[PDB]
């Protein structure tokens, strides 16, 4: 037979027309990815089956008797990084996810979020006013990026000196890219070291941002997060915040410009845009895949995953999938997007998503409300997409402001 090769640019150029040629040949079908055989779920109901399913573990620390398994997300991590990356709430499975979740679900509140709205719109306002009322920029390094950086420093008490630096390291991590595991495995520690230094010093010097607050936060009966804990939760709230947000102001930004009706309609309807970014996340999901290892042997959609295998869900392909979403290709601001699984699905729902919108809705509100006449810099077909499954963005999209 012959086998996909995530690596190739049928899964990075066009990528959602492959998508659907495997769909319809098979939900569930097994790939290579990195030199490594893995099963990749591109079907609605067979992503949200593998997703509830906890005999698929998200733990990639657990070692079995006789399996040595190296997930993609961790390429070229030397081990010790690999934990300082992994002892967090998505890389955990209960009882321990349960705990950790409560735990940091206590400071990492909606309450804190919606706290920071005006700060958010206050940053959103500085940015903008610094771009220009003409020309063509790119509304990603002047925008889209900073905003988000911004934010989650400001959230968990990240200086000035500080930011930048950490940009270079987590966009290299975001790629899985075989010749380059050294620099991506050296990134990661630099990240880890960093994260190292922040936690000290927060420890030394306590404030009211959320690190603080994780660092004195108690349960009754779950007690506190330990030093690794705490470590690894804030290098991926921190990693969180630097990416995700980015890639959805990029994206959605593109989208509205590529698609005029909708855009007009948000621009009229400004109650509209909540659910806005809630299509341009199931059009385009940053998160293309999520992973999970088969403890155990596991059916999905009919077809048994032998144990110990490496399941590869891909989130986007199944938000593009027709059984649950009646011509998916279709950007459409008015659809129902009930259902998407661009954050998550099950016990591992993303976190973030109040902070995810928040920033999503301000930024495109203020980017196009500010600015009636922005159109894209280039040709849309030349808009390059970052080859990454794990957060697909774009990092250069040029926008002309004034016409
Ligand atoms: C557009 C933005 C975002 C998208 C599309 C997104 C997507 C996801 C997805 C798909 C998961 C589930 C992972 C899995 O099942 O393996 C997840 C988990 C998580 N996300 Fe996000 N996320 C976004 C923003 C953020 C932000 C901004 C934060 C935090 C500051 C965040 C923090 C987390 C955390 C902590 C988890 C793990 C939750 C758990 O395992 O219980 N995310 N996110
Ligand atoms: C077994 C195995 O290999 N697994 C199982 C665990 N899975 C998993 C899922 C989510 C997860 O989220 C951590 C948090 C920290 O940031 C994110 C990514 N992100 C962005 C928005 N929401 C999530 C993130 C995650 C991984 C990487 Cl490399 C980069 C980034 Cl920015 O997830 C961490 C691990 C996938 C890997």
Same mark, same amino acid.
């Given at each position: =037979?012959?086998? /996909?090769?995530? !690596? %190739?640019? %049928?899964?990075?150029? &066009?990528?959602? *027309?492959?998508? +659907? @040629?495997?769909? !319809?040949?098979? #939900?569930?079908?097994?790939?290579?990815?990195?030199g490594q055989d893995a099963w990749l779920v591109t079907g609605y109901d067979e992503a949200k089956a593998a997703l509830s399913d906890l005999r698929l573990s998200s733990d990639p620390k657990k070692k079995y008797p006789g399996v040595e398994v190296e997930f993609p997300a961790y390429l070229g991590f030397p081990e010790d990084v690999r934990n300082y990356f992994a002892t967090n709430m998505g890389t955990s499975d209960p009882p321990t996810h349960?705990?950790?979740?409560?735990?940091?679900?206590q400071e990492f509140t909606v309450r804190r979020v919606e706290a920071m709205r005006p700060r958010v719109e206050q940053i959103? =306002? @500085?940015?903008?006013?610094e771009v220009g009322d003409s020309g063509v920029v790119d509304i990603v390094d002047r925008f889209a990026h900073p905003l988000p950086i911004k934010v989650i420093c400001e959230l968990l008490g990240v200086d000035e000196a500080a930011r930048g630096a950490f940009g270079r390291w987590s966009s290299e991590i975001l790629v899985m890219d075989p010749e380059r $595991?050294?620099?991506?495995?050296? =990134?990661?520690?630099?990240?880890?070291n960093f994260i190292l230094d922040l936690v000290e010093r927060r420890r030394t010097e306590p404030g009211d941002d959320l690190l603080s607050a994780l660092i004195s936060?108690?349960?009754?009966?779950?007690?506190?997060? *330990? =030093?690794?804990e705490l470590t690894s939760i804030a290098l991926v709230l921190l990693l969180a915040g630097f990416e995700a947000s980015v890639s959805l102001?990029?994206?959605?930004?593109?989208?509205?410009?590529?698609?005029?009706?909708?855009?007009?309609?948000?621009? $009229?309807? #400004? %109650?509209?845009?909540?659910? +806005?970014?809630?299509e341009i996340l199931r059009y385009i999901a940053? /998160?293309?895949?999520?992973?999970?290892? $088969?403890?155990e042997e596991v059916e999905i959609g009919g077809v048994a995953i032998p144990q110990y295998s490496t399941v590869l869900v891909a989130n986007g392909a +199944?938000?593009?999938?027709? %059984?649950?979403? /009646? &011509?998916?290709?279709?950007?459409?601001?008015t659809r129902d997007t009930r259902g998407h699984l661009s954050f998550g699905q099950g016990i591992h729902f993303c976190m973030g998503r109040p902070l995810a919108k928040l920033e999503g809705e301000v930024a495109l509100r203020a980017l196009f409300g500010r600015f009636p006449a922005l159109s894209l810099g280039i040709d849309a077909d030349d808009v390059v997409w970052r080859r990454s499954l794990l957060l697909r963005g774009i990092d250069h999209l040029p926008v002309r402001l004034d016409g």
């Open positions: =037979a012959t086998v /996909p090769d995530l !690596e %190739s640019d %049928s899964f990075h150029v &066009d990528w959602y *027309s492959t998508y +659907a @040629e495997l769909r !319809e040949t098979a #939900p569930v079908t097994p790939v290579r990815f990195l349960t705990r950790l979740r409560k735990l940091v679900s959103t =306002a @500085e940015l903008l006013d $595991a050294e620099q991506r495995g050296q =990134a990661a520690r630099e990240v880890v936060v108690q349960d009754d009966d779950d007690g506190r997060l *330990s =030093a690794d102001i990029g994206i959605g930004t593109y989208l509205l410009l590529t698609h005029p009706d909708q855009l007009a309609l948000v621009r $009229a309807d #400004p %109650s509209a845009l909540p659910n +806005a970014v809630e940053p /998160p293309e895949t999520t992973t999970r290892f $088969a403890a +199944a938000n593009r999938d027709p %059984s649950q979403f /009646p &011509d998916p290709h279709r950007f459409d601001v």
